[PDB]
Structures are given as structure tokens and as C-alpha cells.
Specification:
The structure is a homotetramer.
Chain A lengths: L7 H14 L16 E2 H11 L4 H12 L11 E3 L10 H4 L1 H4 L8 E2 L8 H14 L2 H28 L8 E3 L14 H4 L14 H4 L9 H15 L16 E3 H20 L4 H20 L10 E3 L4 E3 L8 H5 L4 H12 L36 H14 L2 H14 L8 E2 L6 E2 L5 H10 L2
Chain lengths: ~450, ~450, ~450, ~450
């Protein structure tokens, strides 16, 4: 053609057609072949993408995910669909069914967690539900009665078992838990992970995604799998992990999300007359983690830093996670204006060569930047959506609209890619990525 | 709410979400519970609804339908999905696998046909394909190489076995073959069908659709099932049906569709360098049936009449089938202007009480009109789409746009109903009707 | 016939067509016949309306208004179009040309003021300009250079001459300064306005709007025109009005708008490197007037109260001005929930008879309510846009969107009415109202 | 920066803003500076542009034009705005006021004609009026009553005084009458135009458009202005022009437009019960001019040829005027397929360097092609709209839609240019061109 792009109605139709095609029945895979199981924070966004189409089916997505919740509250980052292959590491390597005392009985799950965006999904379902009338409000509200206690247990587990010293920051024991697997953020902590006798394995992800420049390297995967052996050797016991894991970092992006989530959950809890003590705790957590995020920021730029617990040192990198405090609030006026100038300037959204005015995962002027390699440079619709929605919540209506408009424009070819090359716009990663389709549907409300 | 309607992007998304949810794998049911199998002219419209979403999946819908084609060319009106129940009459009553010499080996089908809209689906797939670039044009074009000969056999069977005297009109042996089961069109022919020893049966359609005023009556169903016994007793042999069937009528609406279809197939055949003899025959048929439709029309109003072969009399009724000549062309200038005035006036689209300016299936001032009862009055999106698309083909751009706009407005509540009450807009029939969702997607291109 | 509403592009086109049709060259009349001159806060919304069409002409609109600013900083509420009559009271009745020491010389203006929404217009122009490229950005930055000093003198005149005791609320000397001429808010205050020898006059407004139920009474105009005589007798001198004016009320809605306008101007001042002393003054007024608004609020509902300076009494009425604190923030979390609940509940937006989910000027359950009568009941697009824009600034993205979407639906008949009957939707006041067209252009984008 | 294009509602608003900005009161200038008067076929498109905005003002536009009609029926191609200069040749140079027996008295006009697109404007007004209700319908029906006799005298003057031998083609006495002033179509004819003692002059057009590559040469203007002297020497007398004019060509594009215009007027005449004798005349001219167009056509491609009356020779050029028969129909099926194939192929719309799938005025492979130079290459929104509307009338719904969609994409930069560089998209000619704005308003609806 002369134009290979789609109209907004065509695009919304194709996006809904992808989400239904990735539906197994009660769960939606993050991707048809690359990720043929339910991932934790993908399921939350799939629920957002489904809320315009069927509030009852979006409630089901979350229902299915909470039924995989561990006995201590942890929401695992993968719920394995029964009998599916083609993804490594599968439940055999995790062995949580055998080893994890808190693992659920009805499901096969991984042994690590992922950021708590689930409250954001609940509010979007609620907002759609209130525009659809009496029968549909009842479905969302019944969900709240079924799962409020389980949402609380999820937030309580993060606040108490992953913030053991009440520092207002979430501790991670695997890079995978950040959702940003190979981010330059973790390079200096992964450098101190020394794999021992690691059992033989073959990769699956790079049989599907065959370009080596779009996925993590083989050395990187050996370390991801070694941390798994460490957790296994201790039967996934929370009390014992701090003493054995050779990867312990406080994730500032994860912490900022949790702050926002607690605040969102707190407001839902007020709107629907939930136990006062739960609401007060949620507000408590929301402020502790807001303050924890702010304690990491550079005094001049506002840029948030992660923290290496084993090294006892701030990790200074130039990735989009520096902008964590923009999501949760709490910076002094002057510092937040400096942080926004960093975001809008030539190190990020204002880099002269970007095809779209979107946020690259790593700054193109960082020595660590790689235009194609997963989290080392590419632009992700997941970050566009999250930043856009959080900005609207801060009251930055025009900034949020600009992100939403550039995201829709990048997505308008219908690739629904996992991520995009920052300079050429080339769709990279998995195509048919549920999460990208869900961003599009939410942006086209 | 204050407004229970959807935006165009929301509506297109919901429509695509319905079509994918009604997908069994290779076939799409006409409706989730009411019609849990593939119907012949529904599959053609589903292919149109799918062409914006996936040209390859729309090709598959047609591929699946032609694989059910009989050995003489007849496309049957139902392809039964294997192991499905909840629809009567199912393959056990038809018994075509046992009795029909021309029945296909790989499928269970009914023993009657349905209007040949399939060429229209092929052109829409082609038009979408040419806007999507080189790989997707190849998929549509390979379809044409696979199935051109089977499309020809389909049109050839209608022209030769259902127009045995070359009168330019299609003969039907069941009301179901018209697609308008209980239309007042057939009342005076059904009155001369006298059921004999008809084996016991229970209805399914009215266990699903429980309001008696939306479906045909019990007396009506006994006659539909009796004609089935007549066809069975003669093993569905084309040569023997004229001598035994107690229902034989020439369908003018069906004939007009066939004329249009031949013309559309002829033009495709020219564009893609198909055998010259096939194209010349298609143009031949297109003009024979155009002329056959025109031979039925009232000299003053242009209204087309059906013909009772057994009675040897014109059937004069006031339903939307009178407007058949508007679809295929061929009327003298003055007669077509009179036919359009009938369509736009108070007997149809201009009736003062219509909620939308759409075409009711039966004129609200006919003695036969029933606002709720299937084809005896309700407004159907299927007719809106067909009339709208045929009008655009005649060059009546503004008329086609007005139909398309009123149809989109009626559909904007998201019911995707089979048909709508003409006065209140109440959604009737099956909800989640594939065909209504496909009209919406095509209208929102 | 079936649906007298316009598509979004038809509506946007008709809105722009209206705004250009009300342009006299360098000023835009607020309405073709009823208000055939430039009104102050109307002109700010016209500028907002023009920013998507022409940044240059939107700057011109503000430049024209600021060229009429008084020498002490006041922006007068009417700038009269040269040689234009048909509005009363016209320049001859105000006599500011001959009496007022501070009046401008190139221009004929009124002698009172109106809410400082101008900072919001400037912000929207700048946001539009930033999306349009370098030439267009230069135009808006040059406007800032030309007018920043004038915008300051405007805010400083309000902060020092209308808040003479640093109470953080703006004192009005005329109901007209509030923009809600006949609101129930002022009835207690007006009843203590006893006119003496008031020079004869004939109204012009009810010659154009002849329905008496849509305009203020003859008795009300007598008090409006008498307040002019009191200011005239003292030559519009600021120092003397507190001694002679029979009408002195602190306006909490005006005050909240000023709080927001100061914060908006202060942030503009920071992004474009205006003098630090000005930015500091602007932040200090933002906070004082936020606090001054909150100090009026009802301890159970959070509803803001106006104050009668002469009687030293709080004015307790049931109008849209109660929601002032939602615009500028500042309420404790719990009272703000209560206030939103009053907004959304059965006394305002959730009232069961309302055609649209919009804010009535006066509550429909108030003894003071009148569905047709100006600010005593009707729904104003004016209020919708302001609340929608301010809610988005608060971070209430979904609330802002529901207001915007109901506004567009009420406007979709293309009447562009000054105000609308809350129960029936009937358009009231002047048609072709510039402000309504501007709101639509801004919402549609 | 990243994307200088406008959304559909922003674009529709800017188009309406432009059209109102070019309104002088009762006439709309074709462009602000370049064409500061009313041009005949421009004014018909402006009327089309205004019908969605105000049926009343669109009627006024046509009424103003028809008030300048000559006494023999000719509609002159320029109606001069009183006291306006800056265009040459102005009223003083034409001298129709003093020389022309048939010129109007209330008005100053040119002395030549232009294509009869007026019937199409009338049709679009009527279609808009029918959707707007009774008051608006009355306005358009009253226009018909007022002007039907004038529209007839217009078509009759063309049919009898410009087709003096009933050949079914319109004779032009000036290239300007064709609306394609410097098209290669006329170069052979112009080379036999030898000017004598031609009174001195200074061009105005290239003072506004100073780039010489976008306008006709000084040599061409000398021939244009000399043809004026030849008509002046004979006082614009129709009977005498055939004897004295050095330029006499039958214009096949003009003729096809007339064929369509007659058919459109004849159908208007039937729907509104105009005199049967007029309707009959209109149908008879529709057919004669259809046949006269077809008689010129190339036997292999179907391409229409203009005819040089003086030299008795067919003019064979490679311009968009070759596709005249597609507008009015009439070609045998096989030659029309060939003609569409030439339109869609590599010499016109399918040329590989074209930025948009639009029709260049001259084929890019022609020796005559010039990408910047007026009608010698550039793409005209004028042509797009006319072909798109006529294709839809032919029943070519998808072809019409692809033209419309490429037109909108080229217009989406908001330049509203007179014509566009075919390879780069650069806007050329006058910006703010009324006709371009009108096309956009009509396409967007």
C-alpha cells in the first residue's frame, strides 16, 4: 500500500481479536508462543484490556490469578497452564509444588513475584463497571467481596516480608521479579552472582525469538537459573532467603508502583466501605513506600536509584526506572521539576533520533544502551501506559495525553509488539503481545 | 448510566470480541446457543466481518464451507459442527449422510440450500487484501486458485438445477432456503402443505428463545418438518424433487442476490484472469436472473412478486422482498423511481413510528405485520447491510450512507441482536449474533 | 428527522464556523446579538477555542483584552466594540471614559471586573503552541514577553486591592463581577441594595431574549444599574468603594479560580524563566486564596460559603459555587470525599430528573431553583468545561472525562446555547454563544 | 515536532475556520490573496463546503453567483468583489461592463465561462438539507423555486451556444474556461495564437506566488490576455466568436462534467416536480454529451481526446483529462476496464514515486510533466474530490473510498494548499485555498 496503518476502529477491533485469541478459557497467555502461560502483571493489564469488552471476563482473569496466590500472600509471577510446553523454566525446574510449603494446591506456579499493578486493574474494572449499569456493577462489587481479603494479603506480604526493616523499599531476590529482566539496573548485582554446579538446560525463548540481539545472552541466562537453584535449596522459605540469596536489591520502580497501588486500593476501600483498619494500613504503606522512593533520589536531578543490599551501595544507571518518583509523588517541588526536565530532555523523550516521543527503557546516550536488546534501550508500550496513567493521576493531563497519542501512533501498524526499536519503530520481541493490545484498548476508550 | 451506548472504537472492539468468541477453530457459529453450527449465508458474512481482522482467518471460513459442498455443487445451508447438540433439526433427522448420494464424506450437513451471498464475501476479502500488501494478497489469491472451480460449480448448480426451465428465477423447495423462514411471503404456499405421518419431535429453538412471539409457531414447525420427510423419501435427488415436493416457489429476493453474485463473480474472474468461458457464463447468468426478477414486478410500483409453482400464481405480499429489483438493477427508469418511493414512504422506511429509518421485514401497515415475530415485521441488520452495500454498488451513495448510519445507531447498544423491534428498538432474537457483529465491523472500516 | 445530532467532525466544524463568525477583527463578541462586545472571561475561553485553529489569532484575542487593562491593573469585564450598540448598559451609561482616572485611553470599557480565568487560556495556548513547531512557538513566547508584566499587574491588583485585609478571598462590589449575575448566592446581599434617584433606562437584553423566564427581572436590573451610580459618584476610585458601595461580598468561587490561576501562572513563569520575584508572589497568592476558600467550608459537607462583608454573615445557598474547593484543593481528605459525594449525589449531578450527568447552576431540590432562569437552575457548558479541566488537574481523570463526555452529548445538537434546561435539554439564552463553541472545540481536540 | 498532522476534528474545524475567513459577506473568495474574488466553479465547491455548516449560507453563495449570470444564460467565471484589486486581469481589463450586451447590471464579471459543476453543489445542499428538518428543507426548496429557471438557462446556453453543431462536446474559446489554464492539453492550440498589438500589462499573480516554477510563464499570459482582445473587439458576441477567435477547442473533460451535471439536474428536477419539458431536455443533453465524450476515445485504452476545432485535429496528451469517460460513463465494458487500468497503473495513481495514491494532473512519465508547475504535474484536491464523488456515483464504492482516504491524508497537514507536489507532498500554489477546505469538509462529514 501507500499506508500500512489502521484506523482507530480497525485497530481496536484487531486488539480485541488478539486478546480473545490468547484466551485459554480462564486465563490469557501473555503471548501466543513466547509466553504461553499466565504472567502476573500481564494478567492485570489483560484485565484492563478486557474491561471495555466484558467486565465479567476481566473479573475472571483476576479471579484466576488470585486462586494461584501462595499461602503467605505472594502472588507468583507465572501461573502455568496445565500441559503446556515451549517455555523454560517450566514448573519442573521451579519444583515449587514439591518444595514450597506456601505453594497453592490447585495450580502450578513459579517461585518468585512481580510488581503489584493489580490494584490499578481493579480500579479500571470498577470505573468501566459504573458506566455499564446495575447488573454489571454487581459483578465488579461481588469480585470485591470475594477478593478484598486476598488483595490485602498480597499487599501485606510485600510490606512485611519484602520490606523486613521498614525502609519503604521492596527487596527482590531475582531480576525477573522487577519485570525488567536484563535491565542495566541489575548488571552490577548480577556480576556478583557466581553460578556453581548448575544442572543442564536448554533455552526455549530463543527458539521462538531467533534474533540473538532481542533477548538476553547465554551468560545472563546461566545466572538467572543459578538463583533458582539457591531458592530451591531452601524450599522458598521467606525467613531463609536473606541468608542465602546472592542477589538482593531494593527495586525503586517496584516500590513506587506499590505506593500507587496501596493508595488506589485504599481509595477503593473507602468507596466500598471496607474494614477501616485495612484502609488505614494501605494509606500507611502508601506513604512509607512513597517516602522510601524519595530517600533514593539524587538531590539535584530527582533521579531514583536502586540499592544493592549485598554490596551496600546505590546502583546508578540511566534507565527509565530513574523516573519512579514521578509515579508515586513525594518529591519537593524543585526536585520534581528537575526530574521532569530529565524525562523531557535529550537523554530520554527528547532525544533527537527517537521516532516517537516515548520513553526508552535505557537512555540512548548511556554506554549501556542497545537499540534492540529487550530492556537495554527499546521502547515498551507497558511503560508508555503505566507512565501515561500515573501522569493523569498526578494531574498532568497534557503530558499523559502526549504519551497516549504517541503510543497509539506507534501501535497503529497492528504489530502489537512486545517492544519497539527506539529509532526506526521496528516491532521487536513477540508479536501479538496481550499487554500491548490491552494498552491500545484502554487508550481507545 | 445516562447513556448506555458505546463509542465507535468500543463497539468495533466488542464486535470483534464476539466473532472470535463464536469461533470453534475452523468454523464460526451463527450464534452461541441458538445456532451452534455453521450456517451457509452467515458464514459468508462472518467472512466479511473477519476480513478487517485477519484475511487468512476469513479465507478459512469460506474454505470450511466449500469443503461441505455437495457433489452436484449445492452449498448446504447447515454444516453441523461435530458432536454439538441443542439445535433441531440436527443431522439425525436430515439423514443426508445415509440418504443423499451427493452429500459430502467429511461433513454432516443439511439437505437444503440458502442464498448465494458468497461471491460478495469474496470481493470484500479481496478488497481488504489489496490494502494489506504483498503477503496478504497472496493468501486471498491462493484462495481464488483453490476455490474458483468450486464457486463456479455452486453458481452452475443454481442456474441449472434450480432454474430448470430457464425462467431466470430460483425455485425453492423449503421456506428455510429463502433465509426468511416465517415470512408472510410463504404463508399461502405453506397453507397447501398437508403433513401426514410425521415422526415425533421436540423443538430446541424455543427452549433457548423462550418468548413465543419471537419465533415461528408450533403449527408452522410441523410443516417445516413435513417437507423434510418428503425430501428424505426421495433421497434428496434433484431430478425427483419437482414431482414430489408440495412446496415449490420461485424466490425473487434469492434470484436478485444470485444476479448480483454472478456479476460480482464475473468481475473478479476478469480481474484475476479466470477461464473466459466461466466469465461469459457468469455474465450470462447475471443477466438471465436480472431479467427474471424484472419479469415479476408490478407495472406501476416496481414491486417484485414471488411465484407459487404448484399454485401457478403470483404471491402478492408487502415485505421487504418486494425491493429485490433495487439490488440487481434492470427496471425501467420510471418503475425504479416508483419502487424507491415505496421504499422511502410510509409503508416502509418512512413509517411515522419507526425508531430508526431502517427497512422492516414486513410493512407495518400490512395485515400480516407482527412487531416481534421473526420475519413478520422486525428490522434485521442483515437486510440493512445487504441493502446498503447493494445501493452503494448502484451508485446511490447517499441512500447507502443513511442505511449504514441508522444501522450503526441501532447497533450502538452492543446487543448485537438477531433483529430489533421496529418501533421501540428492543433487541430481539439471539443476542451475540455473528452476522450483526460482522455488519458492524464492515460498516466501521 | 430521526436524530438531529452532529458527528464529531461536523460539530467541530460548526463550532469553528461560529467562532470565526463572531470575530469582528481583533475581538470576538461573546454572542452575535445579546453580547455584541468583548467580555473578559468569555474572551479567555474564546482564546482557548481559537488555540486549535490559530495560535496567532488566539494571542490577538488576549492582546486586545490586555490593551484595555486599567492603569491600576484591573481587567474590565466589557471592552466595548467601537460604534456598536444594542447592549445596555453601554459605554455612555458607565461613563468610565470621563469619570475613571484609571480607565484606558485607546478603549471604551466597563468599570467592574470578572474572574481571572486568563491564566488558563494562556496555558492552553502554550500547550497547543508546543505541538505546532518553531514558528508557532515563537509567537506564543513573544506574547509572554509582551504581556507577562500585564498578567502580573492583573493578579497583583486582585490580590492587593480586592483582598485589602489579606483574608484570602476576593471582594466583589457588583454581582456582575462574579459572572453569575442573578445567582441565589447574591439575593440576601441584593435585598440590602436600596436604589434612590436612579436615572431612567430601557433594557436591551430582553428585547433579544424576549422570554421573561430566561432573564433577570426588572427589579434585579434596577439594583444592578443602581450599583453603577454608586461607583460613578466616586469616579471608580478603589480606595473609596468600601465606604459607599451598598453591595460588598467575598466571592469564594472567584477566589478559588484565582487560586488556580495563580498556580497556573506561577508554573508558566517557571517554565519560561520569568522573574523569580513574580513566581514567588504567584505561589504565595495561590496558597493564601486556597486557604481563604477552605476557611469558608461547611464542617460536614465541605461546601464553600460566600461572605457578606456589610452584614458580616456567611451566605448559605445551594448552588454550583459550593464546589469551589474542588477546583483549588485544600480540603482535608475526609471533607473532600463528602464534597464530591454532594456533587455526585441526588442534589446535583445524580439528580434523577436530569437529562445529562452535568452540574446545574442551582440544585434542583433548592427552594431557589428555577429550570429556565439564567443562573437559578440551568446547566452551563461554562461550568462543565471549568470543572472538567480543574478535575483533570486534580488528577480525577475519570471524573473529568465523564463531564467532558456529557458536555459533548448535550452540545451535539449544534445549538451552542448559552445554557440548557436541566430536565428537558432545551437550549436557552442566546444561541451561537462563543464560550459554548470554545468548550466544544477544546473537548473535541 | 514528531508529527505535524491534525486529528479529523481539528482538521474539520480548521477547514470551516478557513471558509468563514474567506467569506466577504455574500461571496467567498477562492483564496485570500491570489484569487480575492468569486470564481464560478470554486463557488460551487464552497457551497458544497458550507452545506454541513449552514444550508442558508450555502444557498446564498449560489444565489450570489446566479445573480451575476449573463442575459443569454452564461455563468461568467469571475464575479468581481466591489472595490477589490490585487488580481489581474480585473474588471477594467475585461471591459464587459461597457462592451458586453449580455453582461449583468448589478455586477462586474469576467467574459468567459467555466465547467458546470453547479448542479453537483445543488445536489449536495439538498442531501444535507434533507437530514436537517423542516425549516432547513424549506430554505433549499425555496432556492430551487427561485433558481431552477436560471440553472436551466445555464445548461441550455452551454448546450446550444457552445455546442453549435450538436456534436455533444463543449467548445471553449479560452484555456481559462477549462479550469486547467496551463495544461499540456492546450499547448498545440496555444502555439497557433499569435498576439498582435497587445496593450501593456503587469502581472499580479506572480507577485503573490513569487516562485516562477509554480505559475504559467510570461509567454503564456501574453496569449491569455490576447484572447481577451479578440473577444473584446467583437463585444463578447456569441455569434461572432467562431469567426475571430484564434483559440477554439472542444474540451472533453468539461463535456463529461456537463453530461453528469445534466443527469444530476434532471433527477433533481424529477424529485422536486420541475417542468417535464426541462427534465426531458436535461436527459437529452446528458446522453448527447456522454456520446460525444465516448466518440473521442482511444480504441485501446479508452482515453478521451480533446479536439482542435481550428486545425480539425485530435489533441493527444497525457493528462488527467483522459479519464473523462469514467466520470460520465458510456464506454463499452472492455475499454472501460482498460481505462481504469491506465488510471490505476504506473503512469498515474500507481506510479512508484508518488507520495499518495492520487491522480496527478499530468502523467509523471510524460515528456510534458513538471512536478511544481500548476496543471503540468501537481496533484489537485480539486481533481481528487471530483473523481471520488463521480466514482461513487458509478458504483465504485471502494475506488471512491481509496481516493477520499488518500485526499484526507494529504490534507492532514492543514495547509489547505491549491495543489501538491506529487513526489514530496510539498504544498504549492496558494495556501488557504477555499476549494481544498471544502473538499475536506465534504469528505469528513
Amino acid at each position: 500500500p501507500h499506508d500500512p496503518s489502521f484506523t482507530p476502529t480497525q485497530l481496536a477491533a484487531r486488539a480485541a481479536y488478539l486478546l480473545r485469541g490468547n484466551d485459554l478459557g480462564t486465563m490469557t497467555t501473555a503471548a501466543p508462543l513466547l509466553y504461553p502461560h499466565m504472567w502476573s502483571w500481564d494478567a492485570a493489564f489483560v484485565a484492563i484490556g478486557l474491561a471495555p469488552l466484558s467486565v465479567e471476563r476481566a473479573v475472571v482473569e483476576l479471579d484466576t490469578l488470585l486462586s494461584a496466590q501462595w499461602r503467605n500472600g505472594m502472588i507468583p509471577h507465572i501461573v502455568f497452564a496445565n500441559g503446556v510446553d515451549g517455555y523454560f523454566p517450566g514448573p519442573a525446574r521451579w519444583a515449587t509444588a514439591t518444595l514450597a510449603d506456601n505453594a497453592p494446591r490447585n495450580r502450578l506456579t513459579s517461585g518468585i513475584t512481580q510488581p503489584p499493578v493489580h490494584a490499578i486493574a481493579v480500579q479500571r474494572i470498577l470505573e468501566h463497571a459504573r458506566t455499564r449499569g446495575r447488573s454489571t456493577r454487581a459483578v465488579a462489587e461481588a469480585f470485591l467481596d470475594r477478593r478484598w481479603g486476598d488483595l490485602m494479603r498480597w499487599h501485606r506480604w510485600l510490606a512485611e516480608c519484602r520490606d523486613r526493616n521498614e525502609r519503604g523499599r521492596i527487596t527482590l531476590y531475582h531480576g525477573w521479579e522487577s519485570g525488567m529482566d536484563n535491565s542495566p539496573r541489575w548488571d552490577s548485582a548480577y556480576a556478583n552472582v557466581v553460578p556453581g554446579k548448575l544442572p543442564e538446560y536448554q533455552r526455549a525463548d530463543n527458539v521462538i525469538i531467533t534474533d540473538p540481539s532481542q533477548r538476553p545472552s547465554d551468560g545472563e541466562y546461566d545466572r538467572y537459573l543459578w538463583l533458582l537453584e539457591e531458592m530451591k535449596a531452601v524450599r522458598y522459605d521467606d525467613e531463609r532467603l536473606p541468608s542465602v540469596m546472592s542477589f538482593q536489591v531494593e527495586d525503586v520502580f517496584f516500590s513506587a508502583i506499590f505506593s500507587v497501588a496501596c493508595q488506589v486500593l485504599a481509595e477503593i476501600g473507602e468507596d466500598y466501605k471496607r474494614p477501616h483498619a485495612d484502609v488505614k494500613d494501605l494509606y500507611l504503606w502508601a506513604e512509607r513506600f512513597r517516602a522510601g522512593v524519595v530517600e533514593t533520589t539524587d538531590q539535584r536531578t530527582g533521579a531514583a536509584r536502586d540499592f544493592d543490599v549485598l554490596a551496600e551501595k546505590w546502583l546508578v544507571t540511566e534507565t527509565a526506572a530513574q523516573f519512579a518518583p514521578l509515579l508515586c509523588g513525594g518529591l519537593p517541588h524543585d526536585r520534581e521539576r528537575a526530574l521532569l526536565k530529565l524525562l523531557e530532555g535529550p537523554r530520554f523523550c527528547g532525544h533527537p533520533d527517537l521516532k516517537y516521543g516515548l520513553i526508552p527503557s535505557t537512555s540512548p546516550v548511556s554506554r549501556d544502551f542497545r537499540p534492540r536488546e529487550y530492556w537495554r534501550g527499546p521502547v515498551w508500550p507497558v511503560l508508555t501506559w503505566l507512565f501515561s496513567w500515573c501522569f493523569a493521576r498526578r494531574g498532568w493531563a497534557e503530558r499523559a495525553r502526549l504519551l497516549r497519542q504517541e503510543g497509539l501512533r506507534q501501535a497503529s501498524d497492528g504489530s502489537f509488539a512486545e517492544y519497539y526499536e527506539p529509532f526506526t519503530g521496528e516491532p521487536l520481541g513477540s508479536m501479538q503481545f496481550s499487554w500491548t493490545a490491552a494498552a491500545v484498548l484502554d487508550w481507545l476508550g
